[PDB]
Amino acid sequence: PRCVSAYLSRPSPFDLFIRKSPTITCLVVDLAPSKGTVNLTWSRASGKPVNHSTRKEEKQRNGTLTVTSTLPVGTRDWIEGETYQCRVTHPHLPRALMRSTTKTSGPRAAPEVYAFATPEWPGSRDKRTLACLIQNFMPEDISVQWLHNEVQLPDARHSTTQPRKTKGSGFFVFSRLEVTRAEWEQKDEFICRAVHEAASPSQTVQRAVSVNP
Amino acid sequence: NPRCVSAYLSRPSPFDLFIRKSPTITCLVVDLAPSKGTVNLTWSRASGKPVNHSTRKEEKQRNGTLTVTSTLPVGTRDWIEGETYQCRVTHPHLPRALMRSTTKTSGPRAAPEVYAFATPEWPGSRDKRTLACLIQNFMPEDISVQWLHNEVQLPDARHSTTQPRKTKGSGFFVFSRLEVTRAEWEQKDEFICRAVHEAASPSQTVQRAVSVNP
Amino acid sequence: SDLGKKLLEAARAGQDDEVRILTANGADVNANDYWGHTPLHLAAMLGHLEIVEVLLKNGADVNATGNTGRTPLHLAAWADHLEIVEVLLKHGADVNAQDKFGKTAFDISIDNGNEDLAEILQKL
Amino acid sequence: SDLGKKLLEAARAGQDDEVRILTANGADVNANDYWGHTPLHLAAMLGHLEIVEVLLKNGADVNATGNTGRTPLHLAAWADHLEIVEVLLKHGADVNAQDKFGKTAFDISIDNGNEDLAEILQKL
């Protein structure tokens, strides 16, 4: 059944702390194409002005329409706890849709980062897999990246899981990075890096891993 | 906040299917409005042959939701031979009825690679470690993961396993996490991450051992 | 004997490239699957309307014999795979073919309460 | 000075156990957050109607001074946190309190097209 839903994201810890240009995104899914345009309206709880946002539309495989708005937010404003609301307006829409977002609260705890290389498995031995467990952080907002030779790889190179609750109070996450013989041979140095608000200093924790130690 | 009743129909767990040889499928209906009368969940087979007695579960949710499930036992033969099963969901004030169907997932076959790892001792709790398991490059995506200590299977609730994600290639991968205690690895430092998967030969099982200490 | 076995798999899979490239070797467009179904059964149900004609093209029987008496027009009606149903009677699928239970195509239309299904199963 | 800082955090968090256990030490029910808000602001918006009264209980001002002029009745109206709005006028929240822009409570009711909001913002 077709049901329009809306999702409002917090800024990536990377964008927020590293690039210091945080954005939030309002995602609207399962729209019926050419049913007129959907309005996405941004607002602040304090009623102060919002920046210009970028809107993206893309017809989907399943013939739903997906619409996003990305709003740049002040680093100070966010970290100081501004609340931002996405309001979604549509013609064939009964109630309007409202998502809001603000800086996550609650206890903080910095991430533990562990990195691992798969042993050589038969078949492709010109490939290995690096994997990373980051766990026991809170809140759940985390950025993961991989570096080779101290330079960050394209995000598309790796897969990262959604934060799941640990048996305790924190969260954990896995990242997978397939690599090539060409890569680890020219330098067997890789880093799994996490960006997290609770990591001190500079909100970063990383761990090195080599294929052949 | 939106409320769109949705329905999900699962394939049998490879464990149930190949190991226990008592497969079941489950029809899950979410986001129902409680006490709006009862929802009908009706099972049927594409071949028109009889379905077993199913079990129905209802549980109100701390989000006002009502969740309803029906679990249907299916013949191992019938499933593996490609029977198709449908869940049909009927409701009072319901416009059009809901229908999910399921059949053995076909496509190319690929066995899982299983790699298991222990976390080094991290400051703070050093009476805990974390075991982790990467299973990857299997297809199709139906996989069961379990952990054993001393060759005996632990309760499923002890571990977390991820949803199958596509690898960069044709296969899938999955992560499992298992927190352990000093008491456990000290009495025997033997743990196994086991996968059950249709493509694993023989006997649909692949496992890997891991120890807290190198 | 051998070629056909592989075929049906894709008939349900929807490997069109294959499917078009299998009758190209001269496939048994009337193959059966451990349960007397032609691909046409399996196509019919899933929205592989991509390949549901590819069969009738290479001659597949508009009403095959499912070994529970069920001809693809049944195995279409099964699914709110609806546009698929339409074609079946373009060239005639038996409208009143009985399973071994005592069931035909028009039957399932309310077995699922499908109002559109009874609507078009009251025509040809 | 110190106790209050911790307080508001929970005022938004919704740590009721805490919140009830903070005025228990004699908390400044009229604390402000870097942006003149009492907890009452922060309660109002999020559905912490659990704690929105806990404040008024221990005396919180039914119309505090947000440093963008915004009194919690605004910060309620903001959110389709609707049942929350109801209480505000049970004991009177200023119905016509102006922000520094030139905006009040009745304002937001159509800023969001909220028909129910204009419905009950045309009463007391």
Side-chain angles (χ1 to χ4, degrees), chain A, chain B residues 1-76 78-214, chain C residues 1-2 4 6-14 16-19 22-56 58-79 82 84-85 87 89 91-124, chain D residues 1-2 4 6-14 16-19 22-56 58-79 82 84-85 87 89 91-124:
Chain A
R2 247 279 325 285
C3 179
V4 182
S5 42
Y7 306 104
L8 181 50
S9 78
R10 282 178 301 270
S12 109
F14 183 67
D15 288 339
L16 177 51
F17 300 116
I18 309 317
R19 302 182 60 250
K20 312 238 189 175
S21 59
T23 62
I24 56 181
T25 300
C26 198
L27 172 58
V28 187
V29 174
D30 288 340
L31 288 158
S34 66
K35 293 294 203 59
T37 19
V38 180
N39 284 324
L40 285 199
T41 301
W42 291 104
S43 65
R44 298 214 250 159
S46 74
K48 278 185 169 182
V50 302
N51 289 298
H52 295 305
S53 58
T54 295
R55 176 193 172 113
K56 232 179 199 179
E57 315 184 47
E58 193 195 20
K59 292 183 184 182
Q60 295 297 314
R61 301 231 91 192
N62 43 49
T64 72
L65 178 60
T66 281
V67 170
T68 74
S69 200
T70 301
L71 180 73
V73 308
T75 320
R76 182 171 195 171
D77 300 335
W78 180 264
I79 286 172
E80 282 181 352
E82 177 61 285
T83 292
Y84 296 80
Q85 180 186 88
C86 192
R87 190 195 171 70
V88 190
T89 292
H90 190 248
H92 322 110
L93 265 218
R95 223 174 74 106
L97 282 174
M98 289 155 55
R99 300 303 175 265
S100 67
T101 196
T102 182
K103 78 152 187 167
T104 169
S105 109
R108 288 170 146 201
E112 302 159 17
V113 179
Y114 310 91
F116 302 103
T118 62
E120 181 166 299
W121 187 289
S124 80
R125 69 177 182 81
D126 288 346
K127 292 208 171 181
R128 300 304 175 80
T129 311
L130 308 199
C132 191
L133 171 55
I134 304 120
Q135 63 173 17
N136 290 332
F137 54 93
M138 42 182 165
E140 65 190 290
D141 297 329
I142 196 161
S143 279
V144 187
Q145 49 209 236
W146 289 86
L147 295 87
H148 183 200
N149 278 119
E150 304 290 343
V151 16
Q152 188 190 142
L153 296 163
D155 299 317
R157 281 284 263 100
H158 74 256
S159 240
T160 310
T161 62
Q162 306 291 269
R164 288 172 147 268
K165 289 236 54 185
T166 57
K167 295 290 151 292
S169 216
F171 300 82
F172 69 87
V173 112
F174 283 106
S175 193
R176 191 174 167 273
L177 178 75
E178 309 177 16
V179 289
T180 73
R181 187 167 285 278
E183 286 178 310
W184 79 72
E185 290 200 346
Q186 57 124 140
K187 183 73 165 53
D188 200 10
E189 182 54 343
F190 303 85
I191 297 154
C192 176
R193 176 179 289 163
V195 181
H196 186 270
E197 65 183 83
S200 205
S202 73
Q203 292 75 56
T204 305
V205 198
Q206 59 183 42
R207 183 60 56 86
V209 63
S210 306
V211 176
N212 291 324
Chain B
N1 298 282
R3 170 180 77 102
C4 258
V5 183
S6 42
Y8 307 103
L9 182 50
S10 77
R11 283 178 299 270
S13 113
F15 180 67
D16 288 339
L17 176 52
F18 299 116
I19 310 314
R20 303 181 59 248
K21 312 240 189 174
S22 59
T24 62
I25 55 182
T26 301
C27 198
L28 174 58
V29 186
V30 173
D31 288 339
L32 288 160
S35 66
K36 293 293 203 60
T38 19
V39 179
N40 285 323
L41 284 201
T42 299
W43 291 104
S44 63
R45 297 215 250 157
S47 71
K49 278 185 169 182
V51 299
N52 290 297
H53 294 307
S54 57
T55 296
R56 180 189 169 115
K57 231 181 199 178
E58 312 185 48
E59 191 195 22
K60 290 184 184 182
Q61 311 283 297
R62 297 191 168 181
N63 60 339
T65 304
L66 178 59
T67 282
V68 170
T69 73
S70 198
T71 302
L72 180 72
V74 307
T76 320
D78 301 333
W79 179 265
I80 288 174
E81 283 181 352
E83 176 64 283
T84 292
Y85 292 84
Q86 176 187 92
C87 194
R88 186 196 173 70
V89 193
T90 292
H91 201 62
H93 58 92
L94 204 59
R96 215 160 156 174
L98 282 175
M99 289 155 55
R100 298 305 176 266
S101 66
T102 196
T103 180
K104 73 158 188 168
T105 165
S106 285
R109 283 196 151 185
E113 303 156 17
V114 179
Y115 310 90
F117 304 102
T119 60
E121 182 166 298
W122 187 288
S125 81
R126 66 175 182 95
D127 289 346
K128 293 207 171 180
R129 300 303 175 81
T130 310
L131 306 200
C133 190
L134 171 59
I135 305 122
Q136 64 174 18
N137 286 334
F138 56 91
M139 41 179 165
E141 63 190 292
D142 295 333
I143 196 161
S144 280
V145 185
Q146 49 211 236
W147 291 85
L148 296 87
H149 182 202
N150 279 117
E151 303 289 345
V152 15
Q153 187 191 143
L154 296 168
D156 297 319
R158 281 283 264 98
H159 76 254
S160 241
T161 311
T162 60
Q163 306 290 270
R165 283 175 152 268
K166 287 238 54 186
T167 58
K168 296 291 150 291
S170 217
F172 299 84
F173 71 89
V174 111
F175 282 107
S176 198
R177 188 178 169 271
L178 177 77
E179 309 178 14
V180 292
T181 72
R182 188 166 284 278
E184 287 177 309
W185 78 71
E186 289 200 347
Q187 56 125 140
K188 183 73 164 53
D189 202 8
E190 182 53 344
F191 304 85
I192 299 154
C193 177
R194 176 177 292 164
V196 182
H197 185 274
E198 66 183 81
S201 204
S203 74
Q204 293 73 58
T205 305
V206 198
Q207 62 181 39
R208 183 58 56 87
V210 63
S211 288
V212 178
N213 278 285
Chain C
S1 46
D2 210 357
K6 296 168 181 175
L7 159 83
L8 48 91
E9 165 174 305
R12 164 200 61 263
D16 284 43
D17 222 12
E18 282 277 276
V19 163
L22 309 174
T23 189
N25 293 349
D28 223 325
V29 63
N30 261 8
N32 315 283
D33 70 311
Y34 176 77
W35 282 358
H37 320 137
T38 45
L40 201 60
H41 286 76
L42 323 165
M45 37 185 84
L46 289 94
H48 288 305
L49 202 42
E50 301 90 38
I51 278 164
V52 155
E53 74 281 5
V54 185
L55 288 166
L56 306 176
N58 303 264
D61 182 8
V62 175
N63 307 269
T65 174
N67 296 345
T68 48
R70 306 268 184 70
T71 73
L73 183 56
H74 302 167
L75 293 94
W78 193 218
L82 300 162
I84 287 181
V85 193
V87 75
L89 312 175
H91 60 285
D94 211 357
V95 286
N96 309 134
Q98 188 216 320
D99 71 352
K100 295 190 190 169
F101 293 78
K103 291 275 189 185
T104 69
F106 193 28
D107 273 334
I108 312 140
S109 54
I110 288 290
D111 299 353
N112 46 31
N114 207 296
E115 286 146 3
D116 292 316
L117 213 58
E119 162 214 319
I120 59 145
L121 274 159
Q122 65 187 61
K123 207 173 281 178
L124 265 171
Chain D
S1 46
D2 210 357
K6 296 168 181 175
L7 159 83
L8 48 91
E9 165 174 305
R12 164 200 61 263
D16 284 43
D17 222 12
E18 282 277 276
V19 163
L22 309 174
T23 189
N25 293 349
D28 222 325
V29 63
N30 261 8
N32 315 283
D33 70 311
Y34 176 77
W35 282 358
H37 320 137
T38 45
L40 201 60
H41 286 76
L42 323 165
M45 37 185 84
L46 289 94
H48 288 305
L49 202 42
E50 302 90 38
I51 278 164
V52 155
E53 74 281 5
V54 185
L55 288 166
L56 306 176
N58 303 264
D61 182 8
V62 175
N63 307 269
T65 174
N67 296 345
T68 48
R70 306 268 184 70
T71 73
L73 183 56
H74 302 167
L75 293 94
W78 193 218
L82 300 161
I84 287 181
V85 193
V87 75
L89 312 175
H91 60 285
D94 211 357
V95 285
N96 309 134
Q98 188 216 320
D99 71 352
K100 295 190 190 170
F101 293 78
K103 291 275 189 185
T104 69
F106 193 28
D107 273 334
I108 312 140
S109 54
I110 288 290
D111 299 353
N112 46 31
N114 207 296
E115 286 146 2
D116 292 316
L117 213 58
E119 162 214 319
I120 59 145
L121 274 159
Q122 65 187 61
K123 207 173 281 178
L124 265 171

